Structure formats: C-alpha cells, structure tokens
C-alpha cells in the first residue's frame, strides 16, 4: 500500500550573530533554527546527522554524530521537532547540506536529505 | 527555507488477473493501481518512470519511458493522480520497485523512489 519513504519536511532559518563574530579575524558566526515535520502516518525517530559545511572559498568540513543537540527526537505523525545550533565560517557566506538518518516505526533505517542552504551576513 | 525535496506519497494496490494468465504455461498477469499524492506546497509534474521487475526466481527486467500511461501529470499541492497498468511474470509472485523523475515548480528535477512491492497470486 504505502511504497514511498516516510515524508519528512525540513525548514531552516539562519541568522548571522554579529556579537559572536570577528570579521577582522575572519570569523563569521551563524545560528540556525531547524524544524522537522513528520508528514507520514507513523512515528519516526532521528538517530543521527551528517553535515557538509562549505565556506565561500570552497573549504569543506564534515560534522557528524548521533542525535541533534544531544537527543534523538521521536516524532509522532503530523508533529514536528524544532532545535537550533550554529556554525562558524572563515567567510561571510557559506553553505550547509547533509543528511539525517532516521528510523521508521518498525525500526527500519531511512536517510533524509537536507538540501543545500546558504549562510550569509545580512545583505538587504 | 524549505530544504527537503517536495513530499510525494506513492500508494499501490495490485491484483492478479486470472483471465489473462496461464499457470500451465507459466504465465502470471497482474494489474497495478498507483496513486501519487502531492504533499508539498508546490505544483509538481511527473515526467518519466523507471521500473525494475523481479520475478520469484530473480529474473530482472527494466521498463522505462516518459509519462505514465501516455501522460505527464501535473499535480497540484494536496491533489493526487491515479493510473493503472499491468505486468506479466513467469512466476505466481514477484516484486516491482523503481523511480519517478519529477520536476518542481521552478522546473528542477528530483527523483521519487518507488519502494519494492510484491505482486502475488491470491494467498489468504
């Protein structure tokens, strides 16, 4: 009957933290706030994460581990989980992309892609 | 920022077609009815498909082409598209899995995985 992977919708908002940064010393600090909405009919659980973080010059770093912010959130159908974290770059703009490794209700592994998004100093 | 690919829910029901089959001659025919639901907030379009069909003895076949049933359905948010089609195997059971290639509202490509489902003679 269901033959699609559980639908997980991810949104992100970002903000440059001027109070933690030092442009002079090439240190640009960003905060990110991420919402994970379970759009499937089962409860799912975020087990681990892997980030690929690229600065504006193209320098790549990998950051992985279990959970987000120290936890493995269990998300019911039609529920969501939000958290925030941060990264520092050597440049005023950069990109993060990666994946969450989740499990479904039967303890089955599935990977969820976090599409690339930009980190940027204000530019309106 | 939405940073996951559009959520597309695929469901399926299959049926063995006794009138089209000939067990004596090892010919087993199944029909399949697929519903594709747009759970994102943009209009998407299904452009092509690719199937891997596996019979109960492991014999594999690939079937691919543009559209489904001649069409490239344009599917709005919270609408759905249903079609049926059919496959014949040498064996009373087998498996189908594959992919749809869709485009999003900006006309970007994304692949939707159709997980394995079984085709089977009735066995209740």
């Amino acid at each position: 009957m269901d033959v699609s992977l559980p639908c997980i919708k991810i949104q992100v908002q970002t903000r440059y933290i001027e109070e933690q940064s030092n442009p002079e010393y090439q240190r640009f600090v960003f905060a990110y706030l991420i919402t994970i909405k379970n759009l499937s009919s089962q409860t799912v659980q975020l087990m681990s994460r892997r980030w690929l973080i690229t600065d504006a010059d193209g320098k790549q770093t990998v950051v992985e581990g279990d959970g987000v912010v120290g936890e493995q959130p269990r998300i019911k159908a039609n529920d969501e989980y939000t958290y925030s974290s941060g990264t520092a770059l050597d440049t005023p703009v950069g990109v993060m992309q990666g994946q969450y490794l989740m499990i479904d209700e039967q303890g089955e592994s599935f990977t969820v892609e976090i599409e690339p998004f930009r980190l940027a100093v204000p530019h309106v």
Side-chain angles (χ1 to χ4, degrees), chain A:
Chain A
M1 198 71 50
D2 276 47
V3 297
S4 257
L5 288 192
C7 276
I8 297 320
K9 182 167 318 193
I10 306 157
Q11 303 173 318
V12 70
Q13 290 185 237
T14 66
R15 190 164 60 99
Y16 174 64
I17 315 293
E18 202 208 1
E19 64 276 30
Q20 277 159 45
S21 297
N22 191 331
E24 281 204 354
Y25 282 73
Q26 295 171 269
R27 169 174 25 108
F28 294 97
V29 173
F30 304 91
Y32 62 90
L33 174 78
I34 296 197
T35 303
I36 302 184
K37 315 170 162 297
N38 178 0
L39 315 186
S40 70
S41 6
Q42 54 186 111
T43 137
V44 299
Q45 188 152 17
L46 192 176
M47 297 305 285
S48 73
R49 80 359 167 132
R50 188 175 29 152
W51 290 108
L52 173 59
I53 300 177
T54 318
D55 75 20
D57 295 318
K59 183 189 326 185
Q60 300 203 153
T61 211
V62 164
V63 174
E64 62 213 303
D66 283 319
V68 289
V69 287
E71 45 190 81
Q72 302 177 306
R74 183 132 222 276
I75 316 312
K76 301 200 272 70
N78 292 330
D79 259 34
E80 64 181 53
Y81 175 77
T82 299
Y83 74 100
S84 54
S85 192
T87 187
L89 316 168
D90 301 327
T91 52
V93 179
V95 168
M96 300 175 68
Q97 57 206 284
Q99 55 288 135
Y100 291 143
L101 184 167
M102 333 258 294
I103 59 166
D104 62 16
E105 222 173 58
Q106 221 79 181
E108 220 79 26
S109 239
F110 71 101
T111 297
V112 168
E113 293 286 335
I114 316 190
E115 306 303 317
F117 56 100
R118 306 211 265 238
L119 297 173
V121 89
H123 57 95
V124 71

